């Protein structure tokens, strides 16, 4: 379950920090991952349209924080940093050091400073299954020969032929008496069959 994914852009040098139990600058001040962070991580390049005219300052990051980030914590906070004992009243004095200095996405550098179309697949588990899963390739059918079959949960082996028995909009199963499964309307053609 929990296919919460994020769609954002990350500079090329800070890429590996999206990792289970990693530190750095993003993983210290911008985006924290917990221990045992399994799943997947994927990034690829978003070079040549992530450069607005002379300095891509639409896109920010927090450069300073008092203490450690909690995992899964979004730092939307206008609470700027304080270094010394004199608190900042908005006027940039000597110990403010405004943490939201922005991304330097000006790709005139090498490959290490490039904007990348990154995603962070964050996977965890709660109590409700049958979430996002995979389309398991949906093979063909066969008739009039004994054959193994696996259907959507139930399975068996036999020959598949036509039928006279009828269904309703809800059935996925069929047995004549005493758990002897014999009837499947197929999940693709929606056509009723027998299992001899």
């Amino acid at each position, epitope marked *: 379950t929990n296919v919460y994914a994020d769609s954002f852009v990350i500079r090329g040098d800070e890429v590996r920090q999206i990792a289970p139990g990693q530190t750095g600058k993003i993983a210290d001040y911008n985006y924290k991952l917990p221990d045992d962070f399994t799943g997947c991580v994927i990034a690829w390049n978003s*070079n*040549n*349209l992530d*450069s*607005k*005219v*002379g*300095g891509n*300052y*639409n896109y920010l990051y927090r450069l300073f924080r008092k203490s450690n980030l909690k995992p899964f914590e979004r730092d939307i906070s206008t609470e700027i940093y304080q270094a010394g004992s004199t608190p900042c009243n908005g006027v940039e004095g000597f110990n403010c050091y405004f943490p939201l200095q922005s991304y330097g996405f000006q*790709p005139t550098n090498g490959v290490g400073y490039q904007p990348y179309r990154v995603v962070v697949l964050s996977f965890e588990l709660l109590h409700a299954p049958a979430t996002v899963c995979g389309p398991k390739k949906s093979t063909n059918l066969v008739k009039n020969k004994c054959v193994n079959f696996n259907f959507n949960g139930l399975t068996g082996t036999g020959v598949l032929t036509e039928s006279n028995k009828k269904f309703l909009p809800f059935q996925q199963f069929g047995r004549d008496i005493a758990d002897t499964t014999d009837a499947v309307r197929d999940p693709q053609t929606l056509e009723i069959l027998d299992i001899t």
Partner: antibody
Amino acid sequence: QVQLVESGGGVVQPGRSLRLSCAASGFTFSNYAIHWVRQAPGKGLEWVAVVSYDGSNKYYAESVKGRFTISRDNSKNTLSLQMISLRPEDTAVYYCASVADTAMVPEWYFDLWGRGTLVTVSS
Amino acid sequence: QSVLTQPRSVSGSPGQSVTISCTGTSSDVGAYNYVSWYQQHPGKAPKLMIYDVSARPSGVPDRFSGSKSGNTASLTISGLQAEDEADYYCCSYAGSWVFGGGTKLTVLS
């Protein structure tokens, strides 16, 4: 339609000044750099200038510095090119050169062109 | 250096392939990978055909192709059509935009 329409061309005398411009439509002009690339009639291509949205970063060519001044207005999606101390080698068809949105092409390359206007510095 | 070295004209039979050099310097061509190719019809604006020597933008046919080794780019147009007959320009950006000398492709008819 992504579209760039030059303005400010004409026929001027050497020693005088002129101001060109270019209006943008069809694309968010505040997110991509526009340039000036000049071409004399029947000759090669020659870049002039570039302006940033904050108005701080501007780069000029070697035959450009000290005379030509580019600026832009992100709100009106137009720009300006203030030009003083005009010489007859500056006689060229002037193109406001930017990039459209649909391309992966960045702003330092040259995809979205203008139709051009003629500036003649002659006595 | 100041102007990128190109052949002044390249003559080719229609349907064939031509190779047009863009000779620059190490501070112009071999420094980065940012070399362009520009087709300019007479009486019209230029038009982009090649970025980053390997690949092509949208709308550009696959007849346009490039190759770069060292300090010389090489635009290769296979299958010459009569609509390719125009002026050709290569440009590089390491710190500044340096254009080429100009190349008039002549489609022999």
